[PDB]
Amino acid sequence: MRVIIAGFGRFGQITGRLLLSSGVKMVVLDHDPDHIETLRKFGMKVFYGDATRMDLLESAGAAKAEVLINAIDDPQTNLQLTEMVKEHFPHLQIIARARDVDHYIRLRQAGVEKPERETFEGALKTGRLALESLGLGPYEARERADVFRRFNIQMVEEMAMVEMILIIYAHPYPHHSHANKRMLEQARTLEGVEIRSLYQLYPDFNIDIAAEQEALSRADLIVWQHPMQWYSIPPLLKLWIDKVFSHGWAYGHGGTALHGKHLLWAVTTGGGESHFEIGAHPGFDVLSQPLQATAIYCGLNWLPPFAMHCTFICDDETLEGQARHYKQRLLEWQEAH
Amino acid sequence: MRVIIAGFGRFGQITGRLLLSSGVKMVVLDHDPDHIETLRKFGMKVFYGDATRMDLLESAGAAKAEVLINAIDDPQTNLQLTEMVKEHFPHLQIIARARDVDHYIRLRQAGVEKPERETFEGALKTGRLALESLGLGPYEARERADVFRRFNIQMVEEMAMVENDTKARAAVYKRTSAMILIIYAHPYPHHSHANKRMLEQARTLEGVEIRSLYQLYPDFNIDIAAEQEALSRADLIVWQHPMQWYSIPPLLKLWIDKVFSHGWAYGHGGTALHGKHLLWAVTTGGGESHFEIGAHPGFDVLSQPLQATAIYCGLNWLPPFAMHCTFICDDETLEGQARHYKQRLLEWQEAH
Ligand SMILES: Cc1cc2nc3c(=O)[nH]c(=O)nc-3n(C[C@H](O)[C@H](O)[C@H](O)COP(=O)(O)O)c2cc1C
Ligand SMILES: Cc1cc2nc3c(=O)[nH]c(=O)nc-3n(C[C@H](O)[C@H](O)[C@H](O)COP(=O)(O)O)c2cc1C
Ligand SMILES: [Mg+2]
Ligand SMILES: [Zn+2]
Ligand SMILES: [Zn+2]
C-alpha cells in the first residue's frame, strides 16, 4: 500500500521494522541474494531486484504509494534512484540515506528535504559514551551532542546552498487534540498571530534557545497554551522555560528582554472548577502560581488566565463557545495594545 | 592526554569533533593519508599507520589513556584491536563502533559494554521521518522509536548469549517475539552540592534505593514498566530535586505523566500506590523571602500541584522537606540540613 523501501540491509531493515511495528504496509526491494536469505530466516519477505529499474518500482506499486525510502548505500545508485523517482513518480515522497556530506549535498540539490548521513547519529552517540566514561553526566553529554548537531547541520546546509501575538503551544499530541486544536483554529483567523508548537519543533527535547528568543523578541503578547497535566504543565513547556528564560536575557544583569511584554496562560482542563478543591490550597487560580511567579520574576505582565474547563463531559458546542471566547480575549488584548 | 581514537573517517571525525568542543585532549591512529591534513587542521596528534600495531598503540599512550574509541570500520580489524586492548591495557575503557548486529554481538561477547551499531540511530531517524510524512506527529513518532529501540536492544542482548549462527539467533528472535525509593531528578547530578550531600546522607540508611532519572533517561525515554516495578517494592516514595522556576525538573514531570498511568495509579483499578507514602524533598536557592512573589506568595503554596497529584493517586502526602538558602549557604547549614533529611527518613521507617 503506502511505502516502498529500496535497500534492505542494515539501514533499510531498521527503518522497515520500525514501520512494521506501527502496522504500516510496505514493499521491499533488495539486490543482494545473501541479505534476502538471512531475512527469510527471520521471517522478513524481501523482493529481489535493482530498485533503479522503473518497471520493478512500478510493479511494487510506486504509482499508488505515498513514501519511498531510499536506503541504497552506493551514492551514485542512490542518486540515480532519486532522480528517476522524481521524474516518473512525482507524487512520491522521497526519504533518503546519505553516505557522507558530499552525498547529502547532492541529495539536497536534488530536492530531498532531510538526508540522513548514515553514520552521523551513531558517531554522535559514541561521543556521548566517551564523554560519560570520562565523567560527564549522561544528560550533559546529550545536551552537548544536541548543540554540536545543530551547529553541524547549519554548516552542512550552508555548504549545500553554496554548492503581535506569539502562542507557545505545548500539547504533546497536537493531532489528537479536540479542545486546543479548536482554540488554535480560532486564533489563526486573526493577524498577526504566530504559533510555535513545541512538540512538533522539538520531539527529541532539544530546544533551540536562540530561535525561541528571536521569536519572543518580536512578540508583544506571549501565550502559554497547553492542556493541563497533573495540575500543571507538559514536560516540554517546563523545559522551554528552564532553557529559554536564560541569564542574563530573561533575568539578572541585564537581562531585560521580556520587560513590558504581556503573558497569558491559556489552559484546558479535563475536570471542572470543582475538581480542584483538593489539598492544602484548593482552587484553580492557585495552580497559576509557579507560572505567574516565573513571568513576574522575568519582568512580564501577567494577564488573567483563559481557562476552558470541563472538556471531559460536555456539549460539543461549548468546545466552540469557549474556543471563540479565546479569540475574543486575544482580539480584546490587541484592540487595547 | 586522555583519549585515543582509532580510525578517523566519517565516524571518527564526528566523534572526535564532538570531543574537541568539550576540550577533550586526544590522540588519533589512522592509516589513510587523506586524513593527515584534517588532523593537522585541528592541531591533533596523529600516529600514521595500522592501529592494530602494538608499537603505535604504545606510542599513542595506550598505557596512560582513560578511553579508547575504536572507530575502525572493518569488523575483523575492529575486533582484533579490541582483543589487543582487552589483553594488554585492562585499565583502558573501550568504546566501540559496530558495523551491524553480528559485529555488535561479538564485541559484547568480548566484554565491550555498549557497542554502537553505526547506522542504527540514523535508520531510526529515517523511520521517524517516514512515519511523520504518513501523518504521525513528530513526538508520537519519536516515542514509537523509543519503544522499538528498547525491545530491539533486549532482543539483541538475548541473541548474544547463544551460539554464533543465524539459526540459533533466528530461533531466539522467534521465541522472544512470541523501604524507601528516592526518585532523584537533578539534571546535573555531578554539579550538585546540596542534593549530592542529601544523597550522601540518605545512603547510610537501609533499605534505600535511589533512581537518578537524568542518569537513567538522558533522552527522556522513560521505561514505565521498570519504574512501576521499583515503586511496587517501595513503602516511602521521595521526589527529590532542586527547585526550578517555582516548580520541578522537566524529566520529573515526564515521569509523573508517564509512570502514573491509567489504571495502575488512578482509575479502575487502579490502586497500585494506595497506602504508600510520598515525601517532597526539595532544595531552593532563595530563602523564604524569595517566595514573596505573585498573587499566592509563600513557599508552601508551591507544593499544591504535587500534593493534589499524590492525593488523586491515593498516596499519603507527608510534610515537605525543604532546604532553603543554597544561594548563600554556610556549609554548616548545608551539612545541618542534609543530616535533618536523613533524620526525617529514619523517623519515617522507625514509624513503619
Ligand atoms: C497525562 C494527563 C494528565 C492530566 N491531568 C489533568 C489534571 O491534572 N486536571 C485536569 O483537569 N485534566 C487533566 N488531564 C486532562 C486534560 O487536561 C484534557 O484532556 C485536555 O485539556 C483536553 O484538551 P485537548 O482536547 O486539546 O486534548 C490530563 C490528561 C493527561 C493526558
Ligand atoms: C533553571 C533553574 C531554575 C531555578 N529556579 C529557582 C527558583 O524558582 N527558586 C529558587 O529558590 N531557586 C531556583 N533555582 C536554584 C536551585 O534551586 C538551587 O541552585 C539548587 O536547589 C541547588 O541545589 P544543588 O546544589 O543540588 O544544585 C533555579 C536554578 C536553575 C538551574
Ligand atoms: Mg539498507
Ligand atoms: Zn500528534
Ligand atoms: Zn552532571
What cell was used for A81? Answer: 534512484
Which protein residue's CA is at the shortest distance from atom 18 of ligand 1?
Answer: A270
Pair (B341, B257) in one structural domain:
yes
Rounded CA gap, B280 and B317, in Å?
8
Position B9 in a domain: yes
Verify that B21 and B147 share a domain, yes or no: yes
User: Per the domain annotation, does B101 fall within a domain?
Assistant: yes
* Residue B8 in domain: yes
Distance of CA B119 to the CA centre of its chain: 21
B167 inside domain = no
Contact indicator for A71, A13 with CB cutoff of 8 Å: no
Residue B18 belongs to domain with CATH number: 3.40.50.720
CA torsion A225-A226-A232-A237 (nearest 10°) is -80
Cell numbers linked to A1 = 500500500
Does one domain contain both B184 and B152? no
Alpha-carbon span B273 to B311, nearest angstrom: 10
Identify all chain B residues contacting A270, using CB atoms and an 8 Å cutoff: none
**A142 chain-B contacts, CB cut-off 8 A:** 218-219
How far is Cα A91 from Cα A113, in angstroms, rounded to an integer? 15
Number of H helices, E strands in chain A: 13, 12
CB of A268 closer than 6 angstroms to any ligand 1 atom:
yes
Whether A140 and B174 lie within 8 Å, measured CB to CB: no
Write out the three cell numbers for B345: 527518613
Cα–Cα distance for residue pair A290/B249, rounded to 1 Å: 13
Q: Which of B244, B325, B329 to mutate to test the pocket of ligand 2 (most atoms within 8 A of CB)?
A: B244
- Give yes or no for residue A232 CB within 6 A of ligand 1: no
Q: Which residues contact A171 (CB under 8 A, 6 or more apart)?
A: A177, A180, A197, A199, A225, A226, A227, A234
Q: Which residues contact A291 (CB under 8 A, 6 or more apart)?
A: A224, A233, A265
Nearest CA to ligand 2 atom 8: B245
Q: Are residues A223 and A89 in the same domain?
A: no
User: What is the rounded CA–CA span in Å between residue A67 and residue A91?
Assistant: 9
CB contact under 8 A, A2 and B170: no
Do the annotations mark residue B195 as ligand-binding? yes
Verify that A289 and A336 share a domain, yes or no.
Answer: yes
Best CA proximity match to B341, nearest among B173, B200, B170, B229: B200
Last residue of a domain, one of B94, B129, B162: B162
- Asked if the structure places residue B110 within a domain, the reply is yes
Q: For residues A76 and A102, is the Cβ–Cβ distance under 8 A?
A: no
| Among candidates A19, A122, A302 on the partner chain, residue whose Cβ is nearest the Cβ of B131 | A19
Ligand nearest to the CA of B293: 2
Residue ranges making up the domain that contains A64: 1-162
Let me know whether A190 and A318 are in one domain.
yes
Residue B44 carries which side chain, given as an amino acid letter? Answer: M
Q: What angle, rounded to 10 degrees, do the helices at B75-88 and B101-109 form?
A: 10
How many Å from the N-terminal Cα to the C-terminal Cα in chain B?
52
What A111-115 contacts at long range (C-beta under 8 Å, 24+ apart), as own/partner pairs, is A111/A86, A112/A82, A114/B129
Q: Does residue A314 share a domain with residue A251? A: yes
- The last residue of one of the domains, among B103, B137, B162, is B162
Atom of ligand 1 nearest to the CA of A183: 26
User: Which residue among B119, B174, B251 sits closest to A10, beta carbon to beta carbon?
Assistant: B119
**Torsions phi, psi for B282 (to 5 deg):** -120, 150
List, as own/partner pairs, every contact residues A211-219 make where C-beta atoms lie below 8 angstroms and the sequence separation is at least 24, other chains included.
A212/A240, A212/A243, A212/A244, A213/A244, A213/A246, A213/A249, A213/A257, A215/A166, A216/A166, A216/A244, A216/A257, A216/A258, A216/A261, A217/A257, A218/A164, A218/A166, A218/A194, A219/A164, A219/A165, A219/A166, A219/A194, A219/A261
Look at residue B170 and tell me if it is in a domain.
no
Q: Residue B6 pairs with which residues in a beta bridge?
A: B29, B70
Query: Do the bridges between strand B45-48 and strand B67-70 make them parallel or antiparallel, or are there none, so unpaired?
Result: unpaired
Place of cell 539536497: A108
Q: Distance of CA B161 to CAs B98, B154, B236, Å?
A: 17, 11, 37
CA distance A78 to A48: 17
Probe residue for ligand 2, chosen from B243, B251, B321 as the CB with the greatest number of ligand atoms within 8 Å: B243
Same domain, B109 and B254: no
Q: What is the 3-state secondary structure (H, E, C) of B65-129?
A: CCEEEECCCCHHHHHHHHHHHHHHCCCCEEEEEECCHHHHHHHHHCCCCCCEECCHHHHHHHHHH
Q: Which residues of A touch B134 (CB under 8 A)?
A: 2-3, 24, 66-67
Q: What share of chain A is helix, strand, coil (3-state, %, to 5)?
A: 45, 15, 35
User: Are B52 and B112 contained in the same domain?
Assistant: yes
What does the alpha-carbon distance between residue A244 and residue A208 come to, in Å, rounded to a whole number? Answer: 8
B133 Cα: distance to centroid of ligand 4 (angstroms) = 12
CA distance A59 to A54: 9
Peptide bond into A137 cis (omega under 30): no
What are the two backbone dihedrals, phi and then psi, of residue B82, each rounded to the nearest 5 degrees?
Answer: -55, -50
- Residue B59: which residues within 8 A CB-CB, separation 6 or more? B47
Same domain, B221 and B150: no
Tell me which method was used to determine the 3D structure.
Answer: X-ray
Spatial distance between the Cα atoms of A184 and A116, rounded to a whole number of angstroms: 33
Which residues fall within 8 angstroms of residue B267, CB to CB, at 6 or more apart? none
Pocket lining: A46 vs ligand 1, CB cutoff 6 Å = no
Q: Can you give the CATH number for the domain in which B244 is found?
A: 3.40.50.360
Domain boundary residue among A162, A189, A219? A162
Measuring CA to CA, how many Å separate A164 from each of A76, A193, A217, A219, A331?
A: 48, 6, 10, 5, 11
The answer to whether the CB atoms of B307 and A279 lie below 8 A apart is yes
List the resolution, Å: 2.4
Cα A82 from Cα A101, distance rounded (Å): 17
Q: Are residues B320 and B297 in the same domain?
A: yes
- Please indicate, yes or no, if residue B172 is contained in any of the structural domains: no
Q: What residues are paired with B45 via a beta bridge?
A: B27
Smallest CA-to-CA distance from B65 within B96, B26, B31 is with B26
Q: Is residue B28 part of a domain?
A: yes
Q: What type of residue is A327?
A: K
For chain A, state the CA radius of gyration. Answer: 25
Bond prior to B267 in cis (omega within 30° of 0): no
Task: Count how many domains chain B has.
Answer: 2
Q: A249 and A290 in contact (C-beta within 8 Å)?
A: no
A227 lines ligand 1 (CB under 6 A): yes
CB atoms within 10 A of CB B233: 10
* Protein residue with least CA distance to atom 30, ligand 1: A229
Within 10 A of A306 (CB to CB), how many other CB atoms are there?
Answer: 19
C-alpha cell at A234: 507538559
Q: Say whether both B311 and B189 belong to one domain.
A: yes
Residue keyed to cell 539501514: A11
Q: CA–CA separation, A131 vs A141, rounded Å?
A: 6
Alpha carbon nearest to ligand 1 atom 27, residue: A177
- Ligand lying nearest the CA atom of residue B120: 3
Find the residue in A nearest to B316 (Cα): A279
Atom of ligand 2 nearest to the CA of B195: 26
